[PDB]
Amino acid sequence: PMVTGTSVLGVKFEGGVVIAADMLGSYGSLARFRNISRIMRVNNSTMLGASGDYADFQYLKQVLGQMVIDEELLSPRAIHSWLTRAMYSRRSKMNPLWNTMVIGGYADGESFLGYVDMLGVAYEAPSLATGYGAYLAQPLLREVLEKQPVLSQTEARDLVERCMRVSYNRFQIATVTEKGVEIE
Amino acid sequence: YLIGIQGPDYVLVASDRVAASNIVQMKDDHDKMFKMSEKILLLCVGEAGDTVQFAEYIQKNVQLYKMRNGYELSPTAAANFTRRNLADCLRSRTPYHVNLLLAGYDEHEGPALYYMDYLAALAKAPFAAHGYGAFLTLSILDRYYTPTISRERAVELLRKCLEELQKRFILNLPTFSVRIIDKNGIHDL
Amino acid sequence: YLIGIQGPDYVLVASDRVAASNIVQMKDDHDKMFKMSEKILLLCVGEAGDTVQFAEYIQKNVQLYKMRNGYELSPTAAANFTRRNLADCLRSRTPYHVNLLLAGYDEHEGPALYYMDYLAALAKAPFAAHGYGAFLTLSILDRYYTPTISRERAVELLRKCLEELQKRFILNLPTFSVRIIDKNGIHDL
Amino acid sequence: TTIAGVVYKDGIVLGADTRATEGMVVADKNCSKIHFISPNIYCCGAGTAADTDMTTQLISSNLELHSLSTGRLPRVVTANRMLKQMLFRYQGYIGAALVLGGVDVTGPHLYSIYPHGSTDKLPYVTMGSGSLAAMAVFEDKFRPDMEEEEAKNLVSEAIAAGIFNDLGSGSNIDLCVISKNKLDFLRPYTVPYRCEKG
Amino acid sequence: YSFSLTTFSPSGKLVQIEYALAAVAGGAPSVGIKAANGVVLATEKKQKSILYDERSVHKVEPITKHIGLVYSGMGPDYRVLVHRARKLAQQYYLVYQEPIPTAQLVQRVASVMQEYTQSGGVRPFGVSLLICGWNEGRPYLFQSDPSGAYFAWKATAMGKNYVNGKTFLEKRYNEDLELEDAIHTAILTLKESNIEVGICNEAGFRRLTPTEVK
Amino acid sequence: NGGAVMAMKGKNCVAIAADRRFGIQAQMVTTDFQKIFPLYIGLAGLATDVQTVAQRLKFRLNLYELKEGRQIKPYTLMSMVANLLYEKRFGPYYTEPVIAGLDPKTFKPFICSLDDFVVSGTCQMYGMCESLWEPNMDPDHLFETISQAMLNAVDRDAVSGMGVIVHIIEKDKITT
Amino acid sequence: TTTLAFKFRHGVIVAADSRATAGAYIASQTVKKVIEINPYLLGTMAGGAADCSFWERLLARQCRIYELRNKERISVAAASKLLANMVYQYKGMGLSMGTMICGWDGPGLYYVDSEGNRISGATFSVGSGSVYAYGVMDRGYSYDLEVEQAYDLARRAIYQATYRDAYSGGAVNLYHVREDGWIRVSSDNVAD
Amino acid sequence: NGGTILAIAGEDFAIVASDTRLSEGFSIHTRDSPKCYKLTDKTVIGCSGFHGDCLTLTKIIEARLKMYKHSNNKAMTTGAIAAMLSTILYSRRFFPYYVYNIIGGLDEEGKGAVYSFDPVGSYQRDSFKAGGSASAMLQPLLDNQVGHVPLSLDRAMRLVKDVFISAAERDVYTGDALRICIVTKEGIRE
Amino acid sequence: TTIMAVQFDGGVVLGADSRTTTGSYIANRVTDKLTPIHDRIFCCRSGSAADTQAVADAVTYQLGFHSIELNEPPLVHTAASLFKEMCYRYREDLMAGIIIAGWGQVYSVPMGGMMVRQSFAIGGSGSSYIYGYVDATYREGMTKEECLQFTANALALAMERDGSSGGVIRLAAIAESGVERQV
Amino acid sequence: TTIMAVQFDGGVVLGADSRTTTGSYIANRVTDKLTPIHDRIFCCRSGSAADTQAVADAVTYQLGFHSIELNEPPLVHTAASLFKEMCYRYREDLMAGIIIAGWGQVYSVPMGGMMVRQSFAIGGSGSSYIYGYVDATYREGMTKEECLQFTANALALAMERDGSSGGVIRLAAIAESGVERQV
């Protein structure tokens, strides 16, 4: 794997899904691309962020856009489902993708937040944080969940706004909203 | 272990009757005889199926020829045929590890036996041996053997070689499937 | 290969007379007997000098004791002594690879033989064997052997085990140096 | 294997979890880790429990000999300096790491000490398998000016963050206060068919 | 050197050790009593010039959690002997993990003092010292001396005029006596022959607290 | 190689048990191989280390037991083997000692292992015994739970079994 | 994973221990190694567990396609031969087994190793414990053997194998292929 | 990665219970996952080993059983799965599916079914099996109190339940919430 | 190596050095690394020269075959997308650090192969030394003249430390109605 | 890492960052790497913290034991020579990139261990990014004030790119009659 960004977060707000991610695409200790926007906006609402080798993000950004663009002229669950097929198929030849992506999409009153591991492991989870927050951000997400079992518009919002301060502070705060597809 | 002797009006070949994976032999009846014609006789030491997966693959061709042409191949002809196969397999995915003696008796070209390396290095052999007991035995046969001999004497010359495989060698190879090839064709001994 | 049997008023031990580097045995008189006292008898299978560079190193101590104390050690006592040495060598620069049976006959504690692993894992053995022919033989002796037996019967029980090393095993170990230890002390058979 | 410490106003709340695992099996669900180096100073251990226990026993006998000799209860920095050296000399053969906390008239000090021998005092430190998860909570929540009793509400949750989120670390929190005011050991502290005879 | 300075007299007496016993005869008096609450050890020390200090070098130095020493003899020798006694105690704690039995520390330290009555180039230790300890159900009161011979005692005395001090200890006291009451015989046997004192009980080894010594 | 080391503490009676076998590779050597050496100890792991630690420990222990006729405390014995094995942290002997037996004269059990019940060995045991353990058993019961745990964990296990020995330490009796 | 077989004048007996293992954990002790292909000839399983099932499923399939098409029985010689050919192709792939073809033909016992070692003896034991099983086997074996004496011999030889082999435990499972064909002669226990 | 599965069927119940959690290394990622996906009113399949494979495998199983359900228009037998799934594991064996799957379909005879698997295919009808990480912990104990019972269901539920309490506090890869899927004649009973 | 691309005004101003060393031994000091792949779009390269000869030219083939049909100068990101494709499909049989410009639109391609539009970039193993000089100079409000002195002075500082770069500093100026390549 | 040493006037002005990461996970942001080894001579470090704890302190031991006997502040190059010795004798069991200063005399020690007097230096794996900013600023005729802004601004640019350095920028000022350590 070549140049790699990390630090992608996701978590739902009732009628929305905040997904923030910093914009570094470091290669080695050097932070070669302190400009990469890793939060693709898939559909009028749903979206993927990616934390892993960025070449793989480019491949799957253009390919996931192929599947959506095709189908449009012919749901987050479906995109994650296929995404697991893509990550898996590349693992089968032992030519994986190094990408690990969260897919947050508000579908019919439900905030699906899939997580697709590079080696094809897959699940939905309400408060997902990919690498470097998959040991650090994750308790900060849970500690709110240990106390209150759901998160409101404002709760998950502030949670991520602080948790990202807990890379560099240049992160874009994408926010699915009942409508869908925001970015700050 | 395999042994071969070229005589005035015969070819003499003989084989240990054994195979072993593990610490034990699992048979002592194992035929390293691979007779293929009236007077064309492979003897194949080598590990596993490759010795017989090859031997039969040659046999069915050597036989296929006889039906298709109405006559039997020369010991040389069969020899160069098997030689060709082994050279092809060396460069292949499957290089067979078969060290074999193609005994045979042409009538008008006379008795001939051929040593054949697993790599595929055919050579006519006045006398030859194969296996790992070959390092021991070939000296006895090289000292003792002369141009003349007789089939009656061939038995003694061969019986003396049998002593090396028990008396000085570590492995017990206890019965020897002696056989001859003579104008008459093959006989067991 | 080594074999040991514990009997009512004896200890029976026996050894193949062989060693081989290379494809050949270089002797068939090789004594895997390492008798060290009137009734303390090591038998050491193992490669190279280590079997005898160890055996004698024990022997001279076991003997040094007898002059220095005026009496002979117990089979157990000698056993725990050699056990100690092998444990020390395991952690050492030189870990010996000797698999040995310390036969012996105490008078008031009675006949005893001990299996000893090269690592050093002493254990009293009702019957035992060593070598690689041990995988074959131990089943025969485990089936056949009972609590009673007799020295007369011990010979048959041992003669039956000899068959395994020729008839099913690959290596030829042809003569067996049978010996006994009985209140009388050691005898060759 | 989540051990932690925090330097609060009057001293150091050390905190620990009662688990030790031999790989994937819990061999001890009540493991003591907040080893008493001295009545004044205590040291949590992490990494290999064997190295941590034994090295702590060595420094214990050492510290208790020096204080036994001067008759003056030893300083924290002393404990740290011999720990710095002790964990350096082996060069990674002592692969178990230590969180030492103590108070001397000079006041509180709490050094995390990595097994290659780096000693770094800081207001919050964590170590063990759970340390990443624990330190994010200590970062987010620790505040300077924290009081004495709120630290109990700051290490029990932080260690709890390592109990749930991690799989090497679990079981009852231990929490051991260090202050010249009082010392506290709370050994099991925070809790978050019959084979018929004859 | 490599050659011991201890050699027998014509009838078999260790002359240098006997002279070491003469060095024990010097030094300020010591006293120690096993009472039944806990042992007490006490010793004369003096202002001497009136410019001294009294908390600088106590003859009463704790060795282990509940053992202590009091010496008579040369003071310089005590400072190092104590060091090895503490060495044996801490070494014992890391190996055995219990504070070492009183009888054992006395034995091991006795062996240290025996080594120089056989060891080259060294004189025997002048210091003789009470070693008072309490484990389990028993207060222990020991006397190690220059040859490395040691004895447990019920009451004993050392230094100047031990000869009369022991006499008082067998008639003015016997059996048992509550710890300050068996300190009564200490303060009044010591009187026969400034002062430091230290007691044992079961309260962690202890120096009798200065306001209460008074 | 190895071998299993059951150990269990219910009421003053202190159970401990072990398989009596060891293997040269996957072939059984002996159906009788002592692992529980008499306050008892049961070592398992390598046979070389089983025997080495048993010898070295009895030596160090006897020097103490002659030096004081005072019987050893279980905790001090635990320290004795703890220090004895940690001396090789560069060349560590592979054996897992699990002492079991009474604290002297107070009839108080102390079981422990060294790198309720402590199981160790090649094994099957830690998951088997844990919810079966009753905090109170008469020896009559104690034998039964430990014998079940022993037989069930070890019959399943490949490299252990073929003989069981059970000491249920008590001042009154020590059953086997 | 022991599977002895031997033939004598009143049958071919094939005994097998039932233990199967992964690591030093024993997943089960219930497997019957002598995977069926034919009422009157039968397989074996030694080496990896899955291999033998799969290969002998292919074998059973091919023997069935043959018996339908050729309209005759497949022989022990032919059965072992098709088997030997089929396992050869996967030589170097680690598909290791020690299947044996047994069955009355006279009786036919052919040991068939995974590297293609289709050898015809009369007396075999295959697997880990085979070296134990062999030594007992030769000592009672004679061609002059009663169906009962042979039952005892198969049971003793399996019993002495399982006794030492750590990875072989479970009950003896005789099948006797007499003239007519096989029957589950004994499934009896070892823990007797 | 891994985690524990367990299944017992005597009488009609095929109790397939399993822990929810998946751990990528140690980083427990969701605590809400089931291992025991339902496939049919009768079919329930635990799958432990590797989640990424477990997903792919179960989708392949579901697709194949639907293909059968079209091809024969007859419900997929539990015994058909025992013989079918082993071939599916063999199909990708030289690169293998690191998956241990326990099958629980309700028989035609109204009885329980359990079929142990390994990564290359060893289907086993048995009275019980636990697979996964804690399987070594659970098999001797669970075997002892289950293996003259009429498969008592209430005591059996407690017996399934308690062993996962014991495994969860002992093995660090079994835990959180326990999901049970009994399979009775009334249907799957989650 | 040093590839130093800067954007602006009529079009990019960008530069590269002159050496194409194999190991420590220089082979050439005259190499033009800024070489054309279209009239507008001129490639710059790092990774190896050998993999970049195979690439770039093949992109010229496709790109000039892009231009004839569409009868428009090919889009810079189109060319850059061809570099993403060529590099993406073999990232393992390839090494390439391109910096594609065109007319100005500075585009880049990490060897792994992701086309990521930079606004200024540097490539090579000599590039890194530049960072403290570029970041502290690039400024909005700088006229076209500035970038010439900026890139030309940047590279030289890079070269002083780098023992892979030296040679003559060669600059492209690619812009509407001209390519002013100084050296 | 970033060690950024500059010299001039009364004495050195030099600085270092605050992080002592182990891998990608930061352990601490408050670490003082500029730490004293004498009143005059204060060490700076790169390589590992762990090898440098063993070193430096041992140089303080020797150096402060240097000072008592000679009753003069120890020569900076003497201390630096002790670092050459300690590093030279174990270069293989060690990693250390020191930058020793004293009073100002900026001295350095490559891990291999050669003490080579720099006049300004940078150390670490974050250092390299600085080169284009230092070389193009260091100038004879700059007053004492300049070096403060220079080092403090240099490091920050270094840190932007380096994902090993961040934290608070800490500066020593070591001189005659004072050590003004800002942060």
From Swiss-Prot, chain A:
Induction: Up-regulated in fibrolamellar carcinomas.
PTM sites of type Phosphotyrosine: Y54
Keyword NAD: no
Swiss-Prot/TrEMBL keywords: Acetylation, Cytoplasm, Disease variant, Host-virus interaction, Nucleus, Phosphoprotein, Proteasome
Keyword field contains Lipid metabolism: no
GO cellular component entries: ciliary basal body; cytoplasm; cytosol; extracellular exosome; mitochondrion; nucleoplasm; nucleus; proteasome complex
Subcellular location as annotated: Cytoplasm; Nucleus
GO molecular function: lipopolysaccharide binding
Transmembrane segments: none
An individual GO BP term: negative regulation of inflammatory response to antigenic stimulus
Top-level taxonomic group: Eukaryota
Subunit: The 26S proteasome consists of a 20S proteasome core and two 19S regulatory subunits. The 20S proteasome core is a barrel-shaped complex made of 28 subunits that are arranged in four stacked rings. The two outer rings are each formed by seven alpha subunits, and the two inner rings are formed by seven beta subunits. The proteolytic activity is exerted by three beta-subunits PSMB5, PSMB6 and PSMB7. Forms a ternary complex with SMAD1 and OAZ1 before PSMB4 is incorporated into the 20S proteasome. Interacts with PRPF19.
Family assignment from sequence similarity: Belongs to the peptidase T1B family.
Protein name per Swiss-Prot or TrEMBL: Proteasome subunit beta type-4
Lineage of the organism: Eukaryota, Metazoa, Chordata, Craniata, Vertebrata
Gene: PSMB4
From Swiss-Prot, chain D:
Swiss-Prot/TrEMBL catalytic activity: Cleavage of peptide bonds with very broad specificity
Protein name as annotated: Proteasome subunit beta type-7
Enzyme class: hydrolase
Provenance organism: Homo sapiens (Human)
This protein's GO CC annotations: cilium; cytoplasm; cytosol; extracellular region; ficolin-1-rich granule lumen; nuclear body; nucleoplasm; nucleus
UniProt entry tagged with the keyword Hydrolase: yes
Keyword list, A-Z: Cytoplasm, Host-virus interaction, Hydrolase, Nucleus, Protease, Proteasome, Threonine protease, Zymogen
A molecular-function term among this protein's GO annotations: endopeptidase activity
Subunit structure: The 26S proteasome consists of a 20S proteasome core and two 19S regulatory subunits. The 20S proteasome core is a barrel-shaped complex made of 28 subunits that are arranged in four stacked rings. The two outer rings are each formed by seven alpha subunits, and the two inner rings are formed by seven beta subunits. The proteolytic activity is exerted by three beta-subunits PSMB5, PSMB6 and PSMB7.
Catalytic residues identified in the record: T1 (nucleophile)
EC number: 3.4.25.1
Location(s), subcellular: Cytoplasm; Nucleus
Residues of the full protein shown: 44 to 250 of 277
One BP term from GO: proteasome-mediated ubiquitin-dependent protein catabolic process
Domain of life: Eukaryota
Similarity comment: Belongs to the peptidase T1B family.
Curated annotation (Swiss-Prot), chain F:
Subunit relationships: The 26S proteasome consists of a 20S proteasome core and two 19S regulatory subunits. The 20S proteasome core is a barrel-shaped complex made of 28 subunits that are arranged in four stacked rings. The two outer rings are each formed by seven alpha subunits, and the two inner rings are formed by seven beta subunits. The proteolytic activity is exerted by three beta-subunits PSMB5, PSMB6 and PSMB7. (Microbial infection) Interacts with HIV-1 TAT protein.
Organism of this sequence: Homo sapiens
Name by which UniProt lists this protein: Proteasome subunit beta type-3
SUPFAM superfamilies: N-terminal nucleophile aminohydrolases (Ntn hydrolases)
Function: Non-catalytic component of the 20S core proteasome complex involved in the proteolytic degradation of most intracellular proteins. This complex plays numerous essential roles within the cell by associating with different regulatory particles. Associated with two 19S regulatory particles, forms the 26S proteasome and thus participates in the ATP-dependent degradation of ubiquitinated proteins.
UniProt keyword Transferase, yes or no: no
Localization of this protein: Cytoplasm; Nucleus
Induction details: Up-regulated in asthenozoospermic sperm.
Any GO CC annotation of this UniProt entry: proteasome core complex, beta-subunit complex
Key words of the record: Acetylation, Cytoplasm, Host-virus interaction, Nucleus, Proteasome
Gene name for this UniProt entry: PSMB3
Any GO BP annotation: proteasome-mediated ubiquitin-dependent protein catabolic process
The UniProt record lists the keyword Repeat: no
Modified residues (N6-acetyllysine): K67
Pfam families listed in its UniProt record: Proteasome (PF00227)
Swiss-Prot record, chain G:
E.C. no: 3.4.25.1
Localization in the cell: Cytoplasm; Nucleus
Keywords: Cytoplasm, Host-virus interaction, Hydrolase, Nucleus, Protease, Proteasome, Threonine protease, Zymogen
Binding positions (bortezomib): A49
Main location: cytoplasm
Conditions for induction: Down-regulated by IFNG/IFN-gamma (at protein level). Induced in breast cancer tissue. Up-regulated by sulforaphane in breast cancer cells.
Name of encoding gene: PSMB5
Example of a GO biological process term: proteolysis
Catalytic activity entry: Cleavage of peptide bonds with very broad specificity
Group of enzyme by EC: hydrolase
Superkingdom, taxonomy of origin: Eukaryota
GO cellular component terms, semicolon-separated: centrosome; cytoplasm; cytosol; extracellular exosome; nucleoplasm; nucleus; proteasome complex; proteasome core complex
Active site per UniProt: T1
Entire-sequence positions represented here: 60 to 253 of 263
Protein name per Swiss-Prot or TrEMBL: Proteasome subunit beta type-5
Role description: Component of the 20S core proteasome complex involved in the proteolytic degradation of most intracellular proteins. This complex plays numerous essential roles within the cell by associating with different regulatory particles. Associated with two 19S regulatory particles, forms the 26S proteasome and thus participates in the ATP-dependent degradation of ubiquitinated proteins.
The keyword Transmembrane helix is assigned to this record: no
Family assignment from sequence similarity: Belongs to the peptidase T1B family.
